[PDB]
Write a protein that binds this ligand. Sequence first.
Ligand SMILES: CN1Cc2ccccc2NC1=O
Ligand SMILES: CN1Cc2ccccc2NC1=O
Lengths: 113, 112
Amino acid sequence: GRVTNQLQYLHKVVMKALWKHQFAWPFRQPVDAVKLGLPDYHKIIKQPMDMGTIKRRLENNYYWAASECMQDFNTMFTNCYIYNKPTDDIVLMAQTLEKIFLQKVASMPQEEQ
Amino acid sequence: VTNQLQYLHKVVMKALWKHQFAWPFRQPVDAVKLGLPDYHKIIKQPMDMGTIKRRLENNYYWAASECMQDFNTMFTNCYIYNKPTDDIVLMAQTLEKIFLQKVASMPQEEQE
Ligand SMILES: CN1Cc2ccccc2NC1=O
Ligand SMILES: CN1Cc2ccccc2NC1=O
């Protein structure tokens, strides 16, 4: 991977805002299905993703383009909607964070460097 | 009309609307037709491409972010309601990946 203007923005603007959010705590590290008591989590969710993993990938220049990082954010949110019950608080928390994600992505620099 | 909304109309909606997996999303979920009796008890804000496309055509959106939230709601509704192993979920995921890919190259500053 490499350092682009967009990936810097995703790291220093988007992720930083999401990371600090009061609903972000369940998403800052990989889902621990045993510790959280989530039955069949890894049988249902085949590509776990979380903001800690994404943050580390940004720090280690893992991504080649902004879209790749955005796809990882999407996977994290989608996993949450797929696995959990519609009425679970975690779904509402993911929706709230995801709206901020899209809002911030809307103002990301247009051409990648 | 803004530069970003034009991009969402001409690039994003254009690509998604004609996609081979788009057909279940081109009109509002008809719970009776599709045999999904609990649909509206679970999904409180239905959304679909036809509605978004109509909104784009009629200059309903004030900002690109608003249109992006409608796309997001459409996909999120699908993941929440349907079973994880349903084909519709795979179709939604495929379309959303294209949505995100294209949104990555959307104009940065919203100018009226
Ligand atoms: C991301 N999480 C973490 C979590 C923590 C507590 C209860 C449920 C969940 N499910 C998820 O999908
Ligand atoms: C958006 N759709 C449309 C659909 C078509 C056929 C079977 C299930 C669904 N569920 C959805 O969430």
